[PDB]
Design a protein around this ligand. Structure first.
Ligand SMILES: O=C(N[C@@H](Cc1c[nH]cn1)C(=O)O)C1CC=CC1
Length: 321
């Protein structure tokens, strides 16, 4: 079937976004950086490695649920269109496409993400693997472009991996409200959320002993050095994963080993790190089952299915507009 890729991001959008995120985040107290910048080519291969670590249970936990429940997802939502908020590159994408195809209802695949080159490769791959399916890839961001997702048919929106945990409660409610606003009655959302559990298991999932996650975290400094002509001493920053018991969220920090003075040339900006000062690079909010249903309802959606894996480590919600 035919492929389309519609690009709503200017060629310079990513660079300007990085400039302003860094300019603002390095002047906060504490300093912080959005986690979107982990995912350059190096960071993405490091993330792929993380998903295979025994300590990082979310990937396999969600896959276990999806292998058991994708058929029920397909029959409950009756969708003819799969909208992925993501790049379409995973085995989980195929699990869901296969389930819709097995019902004979798969007409359209809409991968929605910020990298047109990844989206292009996905569209080609899906076109080869799924005859009779139209692929309408959309290059855009959550803030501006959810309305650019093609209309019509009965759409299952998918946002897996507990990526929604990267949004603190305020922005998370704003995002779910915006998403539900582009959803039509009869459309569905399948949402993955990692669950509150033993704090040590949570910290261990974000600090594997071989230091893959540590490398992934520090890599945001390499990205800033390379893209904005900065001089972070990348090795003088230590990876710290913290469980925030009050907000029930994992936090990833980078901790300065000794005082540091960093000049970001492309921004004409100098910042200081005190010895032992920590900079926040990612929050990973963890959820309770009832609370996810309540957040969906607050956005105008109605949860009709909740599933966990056999250990209760991870949850999937199916919600209808
Ligand atoms: O992948 C995401 N979140 C993961 C990231 C991760 C895994 N190990 C360490 N960090 C999580 O919180 O588990 C989302 C946010 C942006 C792109 C997808």
């Amino acid at each position: 079937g035919p492929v389309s890729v519609a690009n709503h991001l200017g060629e310079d959008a990513g660079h300007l976004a990085l400039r302003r995120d860094v300019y603002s985040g390095l002047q906060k107290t504490p300093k912080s950086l959005p986690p979107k910048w982990f995912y350059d080519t190096v960071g993405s291969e490091l993330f792929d490695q993380i998903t295979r670590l025994p300590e990082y249970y979310p990937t396999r936990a969600e896959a276990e649920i999806l292998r058991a429940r994708s058929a029920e997802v397909a029959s409950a939502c009756r969708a003819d269109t799969l909208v992925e908020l993501g790049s379409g590159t995973s085995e989980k994408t195929r699990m869901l496409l296969d389930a819709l195809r097995h019902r004979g209802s798969l007409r359209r695949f809409v991968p929605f993400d910020v990298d047109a080159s990844v989206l292009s490769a996905t569209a080609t791959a899906i076109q080869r693997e799924y005859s009779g399916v139209e692929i309408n890839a959309v290059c855009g961001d959550f803030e501006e472009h959810l309305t650019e997702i093609p209309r019509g048919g009965r759409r299952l929106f998918v946002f897996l991996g507990s990526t929604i945990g990267n949004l603190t409660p305020g922005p998370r409610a704003q995002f779910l409200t915006a998403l539900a606003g582009v959803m039509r009655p009869g459309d569905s959302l399948l949402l993955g959320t990692d669950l509150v559990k033993d704090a040590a298991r949570l910290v261990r999932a974000y600090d594997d002993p071989g230091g893959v996650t540590a490398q992934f975290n520090r890599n945001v400094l390499a990205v800033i050095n390379r893209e904005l002509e900065a001089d972070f001493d990348v090795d003088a920053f230590q990876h710290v994963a913290r469980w925030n018991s009050a907000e029930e969220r994992i936090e990833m920090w980078l901790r300065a080993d000794g005082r540091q003075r960093v000049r970001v040339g492309a921004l004409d900006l100098t910042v200081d790190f005190d010895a032992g000062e920590e900079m926040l690079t990612e929050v990973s909010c963890k959820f309770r089952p009832q609370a996810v249903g309540a957040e969906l309802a607050a956005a105008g959606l109605h949860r009709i299915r909740w599933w966990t894996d056999e250990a209760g480590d991870f949850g999937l919600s199916l919600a209808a507009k």
